[PDB]
Amino acid sequence: LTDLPGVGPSTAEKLVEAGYIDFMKIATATVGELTDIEGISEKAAAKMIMGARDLCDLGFKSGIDLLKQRSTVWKLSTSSSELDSVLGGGLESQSVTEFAGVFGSGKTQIMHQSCVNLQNPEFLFYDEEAVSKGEVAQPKAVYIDTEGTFRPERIMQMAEHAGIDGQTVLDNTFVARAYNSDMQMLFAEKIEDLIQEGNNIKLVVIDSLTSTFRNEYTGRGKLAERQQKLGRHMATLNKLADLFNCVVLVTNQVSGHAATFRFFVRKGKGDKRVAKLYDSPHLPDAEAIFRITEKGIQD
Ligand SMILES: Nc1ncnc2c1ncn2[C@@H]1O[C@H](COP(=O)(O)OP(=O)(O)NP(=O)(O)O)[C@@H](O)[C@H]1O
Ligand SMILES: [Mg+2]
Numbered sequence: 001l002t003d004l005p006g007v008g009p010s011t012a013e014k015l016v017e018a019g020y021i022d023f024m025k026i027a028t029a030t031v032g033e034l035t036d037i038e039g040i041s042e043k044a045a046a047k048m049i050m051g052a053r054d055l056c057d058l059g060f061k062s063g064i065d066l067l068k069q070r071s072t073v074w075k076l077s078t079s080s081s082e083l084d085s086v087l088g089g090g091l092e093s094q095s096v097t098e099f100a101g102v103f104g105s106g107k108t109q110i111m112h113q114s115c116v117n118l119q120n121p122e123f124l125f126y127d128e129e130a131v132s133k134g135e136v137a138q139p140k141a142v143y144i145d146t147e148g149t150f151r152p153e154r155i156m157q158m159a160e161h162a163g164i165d166g167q168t169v170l171d172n173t174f175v176a177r178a179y180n181s182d183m184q185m186l187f188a189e190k191i192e193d194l195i196q197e198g199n200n201i202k203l204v205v206i207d208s209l210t211s212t213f214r215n216e217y218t219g220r221g222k223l224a225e226r227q228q229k230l231g232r233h234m235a236t237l238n239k240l241a242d243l244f245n246c247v248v249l250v251t252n253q254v255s256g257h258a259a260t261f262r263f264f265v266r267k268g269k270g271d272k273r274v275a276k277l278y279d280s281p282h283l284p285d286a287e288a289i290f291r292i293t294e295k296g297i298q299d
């Protein structure tokens, strides 16, 4: 931090104590965020922000440099061929993907499968020229469970069928049981703390993203307070995904909010499930057929 213009030993201590340990967080911070650190002037805050931006090279880019930025995105396999294809490779890091669907369509199953797949290095697709092995080493997941449906037995089972160690998944997955939107949102904001503690959080799951908000803001009169709260939640999720190059997955039961990739899942015959991609930034709408068995997601 002292490398930053105007930042000395004392200021650096104030910053690290306020959660600002890396340059990107400072480079992308508002003057308000820093000035509120107390002892950090608005003039110094402005100087270090401008300084961090330059150190991080946050300016105009064009040509081949545009491709380089896009290549920092790695993708996680869903264990389904059709689904990975519809996704253009797999679940994207630096974006939020929503799996919406009717009761029992498999939203939670997909969340569990992703936690398991994170521990199979062959399921993380990336360009080794833009993404180093070190960046995706010892990956960990965070599962914010707002429904109470996290099931360690299912993790063990899916892991077994995938040929990987179930306990290893459990050891590298953090679960937080949230009973309301306040806890849900706070846990999400605390993920940055886990990373500062040395945990390479590469997958974040929110199951469910919308349940608490709906139960708390039923009265369709104060829909403003609700949309404001959820919007701030989503903004935190998107920034977290971008800054820490990780995959953010969220579920939503449906029989409006921001999400970069949107799926609607319904049941097929028995084992069968059909997931319709109806919104993404660069892909055409398409449907993927897969199944959910004791092995987890397959086909
Ligand atoms: N161990 C398992 N073996 C085979 N199928 C399983 C297993 N566990 C779960 N399933 C399937 O997963 C279905 C439930 O999927 P689930 O992910 O909970 O749907 P959901 O969308 O999250 N439901 P909800 O949260 O209520 O809206 C079951 O009813 C089973 O068919
Ligand atoms: Mg993003």
Ligand SMILES: [Mg+2]
Binding pocket: 107, 108, 109, 147, 149
């Ligand atoms: Mg569920």
